[PDB]
Design a protein around this ligand. Structure first.
Ligand SMILES: [Zn+2]
Lengths: 129, 128, 216, 70, 82, 101, 24, 82, 216
RNA sequence: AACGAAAGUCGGAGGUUCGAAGACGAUCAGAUACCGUCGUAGUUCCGACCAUAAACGAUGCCGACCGGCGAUGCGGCGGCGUUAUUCCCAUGACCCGCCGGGCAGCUUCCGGGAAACCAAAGUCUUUGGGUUCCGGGGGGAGUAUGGUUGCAAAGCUGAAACUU
């Protein structure tokens, strides 16, 4: 059955982005996915989106300018300490100059360079580049 | 079998593309034409070339040949239609009423030159 | 086009589109032509919306007048109902015609004698003329196509919706394209009717020319 | 599809401990029956006494009589 | 692209698609660049100024060049708003 | 080498079709791998119907037809030329062959 | 050798072997 | 397609879809009132009701349970509420 | 050298001034003296393999020779051409012509702390042809090309100073291994980095601007 | 732990045809094989066992996403008409669409693949949704032994030495 909702949402983004489409519809809507897509939006990768409210777990309609090469998930959520962040950003990212790892820390859900600047580590969520 | 091979019906056509102002419908004139206009080795090729340009001039002046160029159209621009009243000038154009709803919602149909005809009953358009 | 009222439809153009049978499409629908149909009748025919036909025709005429040289816009017709319209349009505008059989390699084989290199391609019907539509993919040609409701939109860039099946509507659509290009470029003023009848662009059948030659 | 959750290290390691035995070098060098049937017993060389001198012919595309000793 | 002295070190900057914003490469031989001419508002004649749109070939192969030309011409005032 | 996608059958979505026996060699084939053929002719031949007709006591008696339903195995069709081997790219033609001009 | 008959011949061999081993 | 708006769907394509596959799911049943023609109880029925809805004047049946909509008894009068 | 293409008459006249205007509009290069015109003194080739391939007939075997050739100008430019013909010098000559016709530019990028001139591929690129999947990885300054010999030739020819490689599959068949490395380094000018996010201005085409020169 | 084709084994009833083994004929140098005549055990049923098949989609299961098209099976909804006949007649049979689930199809430069081909065997070096059994060059061999299941035929678990 459906496990780990964030993964199936990001595979929906990726399959509908590779076809060059302009808008996706994501279902369900966590509060994990709204902070994750906040992270991808603030870096200028997806633009605006809407959280459609039915009284069940909602849907999300995302605008897409294709700027997004890959949006992926890491499952299970491995504990990433601050010495294991360089070993993880060497593996998943395509460059030292761009690409990001999103990881869920005790200051909030954040990307991997902010977690070095805030001096904290936590569990990994996925990546986008 | 008397089928003409590649040289006697390609060389005859490249003889016909240029030099059309000299050729004609009689074989004995074109046979004598063919030595000023070419360098052909011996005459049996030249009689076969003359026989195909006589057969091609027998063909060509009543319509277009596929292999011949638009030097033919230089002959048809040198030698060669509408009606008086056009076939799109008809005075009643039958319109089945879905088209009339389209024209009403395109801000036309206040002007009436058209006449809407009765809609069809039955939807049997498919084949079994 | 353009949200301009000098370029809008008049009742004379709409009477030509009604009398020719441009608005009567086919009985099948390729799934990315359904932004042009108004509704499907009881007969099974889909009705082509004529305002979409006019706005795509004027956008096509904008694309055709946007080339400085008129000699490297090339027009294709392989089927018999559009050959005379292609030759009349090419004599009217100064385009280059290719009517009849289209030998493959005429855009990509450089050493063959008919090797052209045009800058735009206008074809008659995008299913029967798919050989220059596929050969437009190696030479970077944008391609304009007069498209029926059941006609595939692979490799065409500007689809002009019409009934490209009959004689009258093909001859009319090439006539309206010639008229919009010659008005936009500056040759004919917009206010007079153009002095060329659409019957110069229609197809003449051998039975139709033999019934015209034997008069009563 | 593999078993890839977070508390599943025992299934993965007791899988790869058992499917290592289908690898032929691990089975041939870690089961112990190879070292008992080998005439050296894991040495590099062995000293021995020549019983009888033989000649053996080569395999089929070659033709020779190879000189060997028992 | 741009090193620390501010220099632009790239060979060239490739075009991007107007429909999908993919990088039209050196050997995307099915990609187009299409001019669509403007007209003057009072006379309806071509006055020399252009609109330029580029579509990569992979959008063209799946039949989606027509609708993107219709949307891009609709949003820059060529197709009417009905 | 997969040769045919349907494997030369009509068994899609069931486990077992009950077999029939061939009419020419009595070889037990399944019901749908066998090549069914329905042969209708007149009972009297085309030749002898010209002189049957002078012997009938009934005026205007149209003679009956013979309704034979034939199953055939896959070996005895290519022996009996009912069904013959075709190209790799015209095997996707499953229109039955024309009997009309 | 067709592998069913190789199977059948090792079947006959094992049937004769278990015949000869349970006499004692 | 491929520029298609998912946030503003048209009502033709919102009465087309299955009742779970809309943006907001909404049921395809409705509440009626059945008027029996020889009595004066306005009686409230479901559209898709599964019991025989008995009226209390002249004790007749208004509707019949079927797999879809309940077929009302012929000659009564109904309208949809709200 | 009499040109036959429209691009050739723009190039054997000083109308196209660099090769990246031809690459920039994806204009198809169809004659090999344009690459001899632009790159000139800096073109060095090296022949990769000469393999005999044999066709069985009732006349015995009929043996061909199939040559691979790499070419390149070592800042940006790399080509690989395969031409199979009956004599070995004929196969090498045709492979050099086809290797000039397939030259693509390489986008080279940096490792971190980007001072200076670009020394590696900008990102991890992967190319696949046959069964060989050849991955090219950015590297530090001054590590050399860590690879097999056949892509070391292709990566040292393109002007890439540093790379790390990982290759999967049956690499011994040389054609797929060099074609997969050529698919790996022809792909760096299709990869959308965050610095190529800037919105493009469109300039006039070479055939659009030089079209009143060309009609003479 | 339940079911598991056919053959097989045991107890009983039944036995028309087919039919291993077998007895004869004839084809061949020879056929103790195909080809004919007859036939036991079996095929058939009721109880008790055995658990293997090219048990095949040679493709584990649950969920997601990703182009089209025209029919077909079932259930539902909405639409010109046409037909009952024996009451505008009831309800069914057809016609044009829509939604869900299902057996399959044709096409496609989505994508994959070594290719055959596949709308999954796709979304995979731009590599992690969950989970179960299993493969590691070819033979040796599914053999030897050991274990256990079975009245028996056998089943499951099941290796080396050596060789290439
Ligand atoms: Zn048979």
């Amino acid at each position: 059955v459906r496990m780990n909702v964030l993964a199936d949402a990001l595979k929906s983004i990726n399959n509908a982005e590779k076809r060059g489409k302009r808008q996706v519809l994501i279902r369900p809507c966590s509060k994990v996915i709204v902070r994750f897509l906040t992270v991808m939006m603030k870096h200028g990768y997806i633009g605006e989106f809407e959280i459609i409210d039915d009284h069940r777990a909602g849907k999300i309609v995302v605008n897409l300018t294709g700027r997004l090469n890959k949006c992926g998930v890491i499952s299970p959520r491995f504990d990433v300490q601050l010495k294991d962040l360089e070993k993880w950003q060497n593996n998943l990212l395509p460059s030292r100059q761009f690409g990001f790892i999103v990881l869920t820390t005790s200051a909030g859900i954040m990307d991997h360079e902010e977690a070095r600047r805030k001096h904290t580590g936590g569990k990994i969520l996925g990546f986008f580049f | 079998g008397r089928v003409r091979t590649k040289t006697v019906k390609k060389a005859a056509r490249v003889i016909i593309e240029k030099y059309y102002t000299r050729l004609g419908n009689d074989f004995h004139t074109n046979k004598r034409v063919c030595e000023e206009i070419a360098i052909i080795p011996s005459k049996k090729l030249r009689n076969k070339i003359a026989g195909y340009v006589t057969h091609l001039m027998k063909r060509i002046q009543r319509g277009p040949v596929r292999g011949i160029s638009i030097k033919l159209q230089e002959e048809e621009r040198e030698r060669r239609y509408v009606p008086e009243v056009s076939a799109l000038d008809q005075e009643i154009i039958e319109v089945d009423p879905d088209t009339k709803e389209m024209l009403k919602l395109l801000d036309f149909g206040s002007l009436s030159n058209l006449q809407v005809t009765q809609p069809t009953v039955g939807m049997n358009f498919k084949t079994p | 086009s353009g949200a301009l009222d000098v370029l809008q439809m008049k009742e004379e153009d709409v009477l030509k589109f009604l009398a020719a049978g441009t608005h009567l499409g086919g009985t099948n629908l390729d799934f990315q032509m359904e932004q042009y149909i108004y509704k499907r009748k009881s007969d099974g025919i889909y009705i082509i919306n004529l305002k979409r036909t006019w706005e795509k025709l004027l956008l096509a005429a904008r694309a055709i007048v946007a080339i400085e040289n008129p000699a490297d816009v090339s027009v294709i017709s392989s089927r018999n109902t559009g050959q005379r319209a292609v030759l009349k349009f090419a004599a009217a505008t100064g385009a280059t015609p290719i009517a009849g059989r289209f030998t493959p390699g005429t855009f990509t084989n450089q050493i063959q004698a008919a090797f052209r290199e045009p800058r735009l391609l206008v074809v008659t019907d995008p299913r029967a003329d798919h050989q220059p539509l596929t050969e437009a993919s190696y030479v970077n040609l944008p391609t304009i196509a007069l498209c029926n409701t059941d006609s595939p939109l692979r490799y065409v860039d500007i689809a002009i919706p019409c009934n490209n099946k009959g004689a009258h509507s093909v001859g009319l659509m090439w006539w309206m394209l010639a008229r919009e290009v010659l008005r936009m470029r500056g040759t004919i003023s917009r206010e007079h009717p153009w002095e060329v009848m659409p019957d110069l662009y229609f197809y003449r059948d051998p039975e139709e020319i033999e019934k015209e030659e034997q008069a009563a | 599809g593999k078993c890839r959750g977070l508390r599943t290290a025992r299934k993965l390691r007791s899988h790869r401990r058992d499917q290592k035995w289908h690898d032929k070098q691990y089975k041939k060098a870690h089961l112990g029956t190879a070292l008992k049937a080998n005439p050296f017993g894991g040495a590099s060389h062995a000293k021995g006494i020549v019983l009888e001198k033989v000649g053996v012919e080569a395999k089929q595309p070659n033709s020779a009589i190879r000189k060997c000793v028992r | 692209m741009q090193n620390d002295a501010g220099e632009f070190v790239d060979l060239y900057v490739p075009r991007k698609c107007s429909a999908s914003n993919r990088i039209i490469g050196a050997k995307d031989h099915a990609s187009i660049q299409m001019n669509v001419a403007e007209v003057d508002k009072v006379t309806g004649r071509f006055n020399g100024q252009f609109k330029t749109y580029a579509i990569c070939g992979a959008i063209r192969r799946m039949g989606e060049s027509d609708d993107s030309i219709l949307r891009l011409a609709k949003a820059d005032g060529i197709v009417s708003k009905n | 080498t997969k040769k045919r996608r349907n494997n030369g059958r009509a068994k899609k979505g069931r486990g077992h079709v009950q077999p029939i026996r061939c009419t020419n060699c009595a070889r037990c084939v399944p019901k749908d791998k066998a090549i069914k053929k329905f042969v209708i002719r007149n009972i009297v031949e085309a030749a002898a119907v010209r002189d049957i007709s002078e012997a009938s006591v009934f005026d205007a008696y149209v003679l009956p037809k013979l309704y034979v339903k034939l199953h055939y195995c896959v070996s005895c069709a290519i022996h009996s030329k009912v069904v013959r081997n075709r190209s790799r790219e015209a095997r996707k033609d499953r229109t039955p062959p024309p009997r009309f001009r | 050798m067709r592998a069913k008959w190789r199977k059948k011949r090792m079947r006959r061999l094992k049937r004769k072997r278990r015949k000869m081993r349970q006499r004692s | 397609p491929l520029a298609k708006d998912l946030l503003h769907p048209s009502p033709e394509e919102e009465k087309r879809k299955h009742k779970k596959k809309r943006l907001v799911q909404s049921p395809n049943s409705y509440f009626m009132d059945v008027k029996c023609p020889g009595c004066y109880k306005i009686t409230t029925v479901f559209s898709h009701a599964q019991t025989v809805v008995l009226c209390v004047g002249c004790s007749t049946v208004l509707c019949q349970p079927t797999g879809g909509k309940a077929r009302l008894t012929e000659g009564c009068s109904f309208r949809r509420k709200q | 050298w009499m040109p036959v293409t429209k691009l050739g008459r723009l190039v054997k006249d000083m109308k196209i001034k660099s090769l990246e205007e031809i690459y920039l509009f994806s204009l198809p290069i169809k004659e090999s003296e344009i690459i001899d015109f632009f790159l000139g003194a800096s073109l060095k080739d090296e022949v990769l393999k000469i393999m005999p391939v044999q066709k069985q007939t009732r006349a015995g075997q009929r043996t061909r020779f199939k040559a691979f050739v790499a070419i390149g100008d070592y800042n940006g430019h790399v080509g690989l051409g395969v031409k199979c013909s009956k004599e070995v010098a004929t196969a090498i000559r045709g492979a050099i012509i086809l290797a000039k016709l397939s030259i693509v530019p390489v986008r080279r990028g940096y490792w971190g702390n980007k001072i200076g001139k670009p020394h590696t591929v900008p990102c991890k690129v992967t190319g696949r042809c046959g069964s060989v999947l050849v991955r090219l990885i950015p590297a530090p300054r001054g590590t050399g090309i860590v690879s097999a010999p056949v892509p070391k030739k292709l990566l040292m020819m393109a002007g890439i100073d540093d790379c790390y490689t990982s290759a999967r599959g049956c690499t011994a068949t040389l054609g797929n291994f060099a074609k997969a490395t050529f698919d790996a380094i022809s792909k760096t000018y299709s990869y959308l980095t965050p610095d190529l996010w800037k919105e493009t201005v469109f300039t006039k085409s070479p055939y659009q601007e030089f079209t009143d020169h060309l009609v003479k």
